User: What shape does this take?
Amino acid sequence: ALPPRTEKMAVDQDWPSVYPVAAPFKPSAVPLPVRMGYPVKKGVPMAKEGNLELLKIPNFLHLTPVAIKKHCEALKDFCTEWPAALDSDEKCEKHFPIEIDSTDYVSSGPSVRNPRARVVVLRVKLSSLNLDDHAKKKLIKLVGERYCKTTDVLTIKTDRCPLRRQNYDYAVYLLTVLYHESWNTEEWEKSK
Amino acid sequence: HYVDWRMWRDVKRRKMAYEYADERLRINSLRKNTILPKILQDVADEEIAALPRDSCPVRIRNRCVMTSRPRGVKRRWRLSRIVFRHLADHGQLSGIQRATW
Amino acid sequence: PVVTISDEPDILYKRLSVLVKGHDKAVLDSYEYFAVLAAKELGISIKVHEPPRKIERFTLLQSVHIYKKHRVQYEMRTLYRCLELEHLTGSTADVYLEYIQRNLPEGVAMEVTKTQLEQLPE
Amino acid sequence: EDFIKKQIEEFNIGKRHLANMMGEDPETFTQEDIDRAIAYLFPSGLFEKRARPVMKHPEQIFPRQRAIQWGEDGRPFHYLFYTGKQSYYSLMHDVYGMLLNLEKHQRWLIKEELEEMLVEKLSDLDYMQFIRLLEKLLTSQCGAAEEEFVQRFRRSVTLESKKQLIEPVQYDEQGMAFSKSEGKRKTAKAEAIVYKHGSGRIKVNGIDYQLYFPITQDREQLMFPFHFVDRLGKHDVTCTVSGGGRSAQAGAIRLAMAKALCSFVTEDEVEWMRQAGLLTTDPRVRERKKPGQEGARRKFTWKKR
Amino acid sequence: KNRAARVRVSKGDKPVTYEEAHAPHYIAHRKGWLSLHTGNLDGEDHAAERTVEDVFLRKFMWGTFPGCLADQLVLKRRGNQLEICAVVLRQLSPHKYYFLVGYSETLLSYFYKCPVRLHLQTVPSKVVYKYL
Amino acid sequence: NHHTYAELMQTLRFLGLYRDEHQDFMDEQKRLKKLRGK
Amino acid sequence: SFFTKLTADELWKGALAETGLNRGQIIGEGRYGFLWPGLNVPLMKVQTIAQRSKEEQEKVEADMIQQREEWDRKKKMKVKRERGWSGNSWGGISLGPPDPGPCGETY
Amino acid sequence: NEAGFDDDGSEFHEHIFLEKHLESFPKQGPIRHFMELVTCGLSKNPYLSVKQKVEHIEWFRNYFNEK
RNA sequence: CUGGCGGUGCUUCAUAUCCCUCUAGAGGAGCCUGUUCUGUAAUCGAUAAACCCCGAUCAACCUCACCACCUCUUGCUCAGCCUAUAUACCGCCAUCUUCAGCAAACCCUGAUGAAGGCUACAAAGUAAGCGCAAGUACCCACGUAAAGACGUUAGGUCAAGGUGUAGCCCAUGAGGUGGCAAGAAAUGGGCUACAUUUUCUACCCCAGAAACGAUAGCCCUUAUGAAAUAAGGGUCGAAGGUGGAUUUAGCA
Ligand SMILES: [Mg+2]
Ligand SMILES: [Mg+2]
Ligand SMILES: [Mg+2]
Ligand SMILES: [Mg+2]
Ligand SMILES: [Mg+2]
Ligand SMILES: [Mg+2]
Assistant: This one.
């Protein structure tokens, strides 16, 4: 008696009250007798209930479309506005030339220590600045693998410290110091 | 408490090369060099020539655990192709299959 | 929401570049479909396609003892789906990634989200 | 046989539960729900196409066999029951009776198809005899009802491969009758813009074809299509070649020019070009390097000898 | 020939499961992957330690139940979730089942610093592939 | 190192919640050889 | 070690080799275990918590060894087949009758 | 990836600013240049801290110009 | 009694698989490379059929898994063995396959014996189960990685790794310390030249030397080490003028 919640389950029941948690397949708690397996010769797939293949699937039986809509309605919160600064990778850089990257990769195994969140680059568009009287001849030489033609992509990979936000802070401080020093160019910087 | 012996030899050699870190570090950093004085270079040479075995940092040969095989081994899975092939044949590895192109 | 309502200025996020990585085709397809569905439910205009695959077929023999005239390889039909969100806020993207990771596909179908801040220069 | 009905009832209960899952009102859903399921909560990933999750109502998948072959004190359903496959022999006897009746008055399917249609596993010579009887019936006084009854077991002709996908002349973009095209040759692709007028030269990748390929074979390949159509000079192009190297790019440009020509050319010349061989891509493409061999197909020396 | 994991025909009603009947050239074709772990990934790295941990967990779980694990497990790493799908067989009473399950769960959760949990395979029919 | 791991496996076996097939078989074979020895 | 070890199929097929145990100690018992309130108790409705000792465990191990010896003795289940006609030959001996066919007539 | 892997702080002005903290030997050989190169390599390595770099520089200067 | 055999006559026939035909690397030779095996304190795996750029995606003490000196029967192992029984295994796999079928359960053919189940103007097959076929994905459906049935060499292996049984239990294991890299002799698997093709140069094809190949080894070394391996700079700058009936893949 007491079948595996297959025949005793009432018909037309509240399914959201069956798989609310992000649970696995659970071959014993699956009222879906799905047939899985390769045929033998000329007949029907193998077993009926939990199959080895069914478990080998990454397992997404949990959270059905109804539960998906429920989770979406739950996540409906957090509606922060976004500015319409015109895309095309032009006005966005004109507003703020710097373009820092603060990602959050996903870790594997039971360890969260992922040496990958320290990525940082101060990709500031110098063309958007456009306030260099004599610093044009100074910045072109004070950096090697930078200074393009169409758009000046000043991307000084500043990754010296063992973090990201303080790395960007130090990069901005160094850029400000360099700009202040270039405001009063040297004496032998003209002849190149 | 291993079953074979080559595994234990590799373990001992690797741990001896790792423990004595500063010595071999300075030796490898200062020996073969054309700059700076040669006094410290000769000192490191004498140190590495007078010390006994089970310490030199040149004791790294990729081997596996299931067989302890040095021939054909990769650092990605710390095991040999045979162990990798044995695990793939049982369908215990994701993405591995026959070269279907 | 229940995240301590504050009044300080937020960080200007831009472009949530994502890149899924895996081996199985059906698993990656399911992951990208679920991601696109959730994004459309959130209301974010995005694009999707298929970048070039990256497969480094390592070397190995076909047998175990002695065999060279008959060799074999172990490749994979891996795929990638760049589910990048063009311009959006940081909190919404963070909550979205949290909901994703709360039940991500084991092994295959691993995402590599990436943002791009801005802030003021000096 | 009872196991079939047991599994049918089990799958019916499963489908009932599945329908109860969704809170919407459409119960007689189509393949959309199964597709969504396979995409979300059933992504196997098996390369094969049979062991994949294809859960479906077995009311139509589970095949059927001969039900009961007797009733009240034996009594089968025909007088040819002891002959094995009574249905086929009864149909043959009916065909012979119709043959005799017609005499008094005055494509085909495969064996597996006939077996699937009926419930008997017929051989080949019996099928040949059946075809002979059907041919005798069709020949014995050509009528209409019998002809249709015989064709019921046949198919139509459905002729294919005749007309060519005539591409429009394309007058948009600019005030010139250009036409897009492509070309493949050992992993290569391009997009040409062959105009209709301009009796002069051609701009290959923005530069004349003098400093690009001084070899005469390249110019001959470029002329191949224009020479085949005889519209030589009256053509200007500004194609953008990419991929390949030398002969690959030459063949790609040749195919692109041939397609651009066939786009706006009479059906006769279009078919002549299509049949001559200068539109499709030959199988000569970068093959898969054999891992169990040194080079491509060159196997080891003393392999079998 | 190649008997990497297959079993040629012999009798008719012999014992055999899904994993105990497959060819090497059908690892991903007619057969699935019993370990969708975060190891052998690309272009992502980290595979040696992941495979070692997977093998250790599988061997430990096989050693737990005495004479009840015919096929390996199917580990699932949903970030910080270790889901086990063992092919367990009805041994004796449910009290021992619950006691052992809870003990193992608590032990693994306190050891690996990650929640672990398993589920029995209460099915009255194995995953037989070939009748053999 | 397989030292702490070996001790943990031995403790688990003592607790009656593990299995050591190869080790027990080797120990039995060694006992048989000693009985036949030496 | 253990990583280098294997399951049991290889050992069994090597010890048998035909080409060319899980029964004794229970999981609840151990070489140095104690009374686990989880099992080895009634329905637990109210329960008692206790622990075993080294002497009790040794006594249980001795009892298990005696049970194993008894099982080994029982394994020698030899029966003298009634010698039909001659010895070591399938002579005159009755086994069983033919079961009924698909029609009937109990034979 | 914040729950760990902090590697202490830097205050955006501790790991790089190593000009003063050098202990320059009487400028007459390549020892100062080698120390500058070592400091550059340490600054370019984001897997170190302030105390670690300070101890490394101290040990280097000692083992070099102990005398 | 049905088979292996047919240099049995014959039937379907072999499509690069076979002779008549050739496209071409290699055969006389330079370089990486080992085979029958030599040597001590530097095992090697049937090291023929399926080894001789196979395991080696490679041999400075690790890699060489092979031996001696400081000590043991707790030897890091509540010891192991890379020690052996291929007449006992698990393990991977070519071969015939470039075929065509094997048979449980039934019912028949021999006065029921070793056996067989046999042809449509039909003379006994339905044939559990394993198959080509359905291709498993792609350059679609030919073609590629791999077969393609019961099987073929007590098949290779007790040592790629583990293992019944025996031996070491003053080891053939070793905790710490010391030891090779060369072909006496032949050879072949890959990059190379005998010709203007060895050098392709600023141009990959609008302009041409030595009239030959114009090596290796050695020194400075990218790397390091107690003994060089892919190769950049200098020197040598050779070996022989497609050289033996030819050899193997190729129907694009
Ligand atoms: Mg042998
Ligand atoms: Mg084969
Ligand atoms: Mg096929
Ligand atoms: Mg193939
Ligand atoms: Mg053998
Ligand atoms: Mg010894």
User: Anything to note?
Assistant: Chains D and F do not touch (no CB pair under 8 Å).
